[PDB]
């Protein structure tokens, strides 16, 4: 597209910059044309490339809520009519947001995942597929809900399933994965009892794990524990 | 209040 | 534009849901197409124009600030060579900036300052004429500065003049604007001390007027002398 | 520290 004639280097070299500038849509730019380049992401490239897409989506999560709140309560008894502006509103950043869910599907679908051999590499693809595909399950509504769970639950038990075989507990890509999938089931599944099991289960294995960690690797496992920990308390 | 999932990093 | 096709007060209704939602670009947007009705603007609706293109350039101008800081660094001895890619992505947002500018300035003149009879809205376009080409001074250089400082300070000047014989020493608009003139003294046109003296002379003024005032309307002109305050301190 | 200007509102 319109970075194809962008070297390689100079897009991830520009993301950086973006990040530093809070530029997070021109990251997500960047970082898509580097994708589109065809050669595999580096540990450093594909948090870049997840940086960028969760504060631009992040953006819109957080704008298609207060939006949908405000038509909510339009719909209450007793509130006057305001016309279709708020529904129509609403549906524009509603479209933008899948939009960009799309493009993070299309990346990983052409050709990250298929390409991704080494676990850290095909876990961290898995779990964002899980992810953009509960972002998509927020805003629907129905039976096309229903296969865009599926999907998200699939793509979250698969990255699951290799994560447990080859990644130590207190592997911050295993942990990152078993708390958002852990998200999953009380926000999106209506399963908070999987939810908390999961939840324990993950903080328990890695407390017991953290004896083996350097102190730099110690922190940054706590740190997703304490998360763990947090929604624990909230939904307990 | 909203359940906390990961932060990119 | 793409805004044609959507009524004025739909335009309206929707600026304010931006607003709500923090989706500034989308505000701007709305606004510019309600300008583009004909129509003059009420207080509010001038309001709602300002917010949203401040809030527009206001992201813009930081990211500028930061990639201009990085760029600077990369000039110094010592420094190694990376290349074009800081000054071709500094350049990239300076040109959306100053394309967001020149969109202001082009309402501004296609046709709101012309049709602008009362003091409040006239004095509000001319305060907002001379702070969008503030923001085009403060990435210009050279010749081309001296020729947008001068349109900057222009434009300033008539606002001053209209304002200092229609409107109270502690009208807010009035307030703001002498506030805003008074850092382009300071940042922009090498004049520290005459920015020292509006500042002084604009904050003594409206103390002795605060007597006329409603409660309401003393927290309104109170909050704008504080920032005159503020920069006086920082400034001595 | 740079100079304050005025916030819209
Ligand atoms: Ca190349
Ligand atoms: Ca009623
Ligand atoms: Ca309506
Ligand atoms: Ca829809
Ligand atoms: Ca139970
Ligand atoms: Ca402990
Ligand atoms: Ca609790
Ligand atoms: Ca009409
Ligand atoms: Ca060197
Ligand atoms: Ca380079
Ligand atoms: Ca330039
Ligand atoms: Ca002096
Ligand atoms: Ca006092
Ligand atoms: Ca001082
Ligand atoms: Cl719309
Ligand atoms: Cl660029």
Same mark, same amino acid.
């Given at each position: 597209?319109?970075?194809?004639?962008?070297?390689?280097?100079? =897009? *991830?070299?520009? !993301?950086?910059? /973006? $990040?530093?500038?809070?530029? &997070?849509?021109? @990251?997500?730019?960047?970082?898509?044309?580097?994708?589109?380049?065809?050669?595999?992401?580096?540990?450093?490239?594909?948090?870049?490339?997840?940086?960028?897409?969760?504060?631009?989506?992040?953006?819109?999560?957080?704008?298609?809520?207060?939006?949908?709140?405000?038509?909510?309560?339009?719909?209450?008894?007793?509130?006057?009519?305001?016309?279709?502006?708020?529904?129509?509103?609403?549906?524009?950043?509603?479209?933008?947001?899948?939009?960009?869910?799309?493009?993070?599907?299309?990346?990983?679908?052409?050709? =990250? *995942?298929?390409? !991704?051999?080494? /676990? $850290?590499?095909?876990?961290? &693809?898995?779990? @964002?597929?899980?992810?953009?595909?509960?972002?998509?399950?927020?805003?629907?509504?129905?039976?096309?809900?229903?296969?865009?769970?599926?999907?998200?639950?699939?793509?979250?038990?698969?990255?699951?399933?290799?994560?447990?075989?080859?990644?130590?507990?207190?592997?911050?890509?295993?942990?990152?994965?078993?708390?958002?999938?852990?998200?999953?089931?009380?926000?999106?599944?209506?399963?908070?009892?999987?939810?908390?099991?999961?939840?324990?289960?993950?903080?328990?294995?890695?407390?017991?794990?953290?004896?083996? =960690?350097?102190?730099?690797?110690?922190?940054?496992?706590?740190?997703?524990?304490?998360?763990?920990?947090?929604?624990?308390?909230?939904?307990? | 209040?909203?359940?906390?999932?990961?932060?990119?990093?």
């Amino acid at each position: 597209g319109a970075m194809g004639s962008m070297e390689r280097a100079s =897009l *991830i070299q520009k !993301a950086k910059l /973006a $990040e530093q500038a809070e530029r &997070y849509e021109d @990251m997500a730019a960047f970082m898509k044309g580097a994708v589109e380049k065809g050669e595999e992401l580096s540990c450093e490239e594909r948090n870049l490339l997840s940086v960028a897409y969760k504060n631009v989506v992040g953006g819109q999560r957080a704008a298609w809520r207060v939006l949908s709140s405000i038509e909510q309560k339009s719909n209450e008894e007793g509130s006057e009519e305001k016309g279709p502006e708020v529904r129509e509103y609403r549906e524009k950043v509603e479209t933008e947001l899948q939009g960009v869910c799309d493009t993070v599907l299309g990346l990983l679908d052409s050709h =990250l *995942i298929k390409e !991704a051999g080494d /676990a $850290e590499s095909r876990v961290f &693809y898995l779990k @964002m597929k899980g992810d953009y595909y509960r972002y998509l399950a927020e805003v629907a509504t129905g039976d096309d809900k229903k296969r865009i769970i599926d999907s998200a639950r699939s793509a979250y038990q698969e990255a699951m399933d290799i994560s447990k075989k080859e990644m130590p507990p207190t592997n911050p890509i295993r942990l990152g994965l078993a708390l958002n999938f852990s998200v999953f089931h009380y926000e999106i599944a209506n399963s908070p009892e999987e939810a908390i099991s999961l939840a324990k289960t993950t903080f328990d294995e890695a407390m017991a794990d953290l004896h083996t =960690l350097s102190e730099d690797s110690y922190k940054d496992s706590t740190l997703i524990m304490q998360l763990l920990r947090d929604n624990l308390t909230l939904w307990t | 209040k909203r359940s906390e999932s990961g932060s990119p990093s």
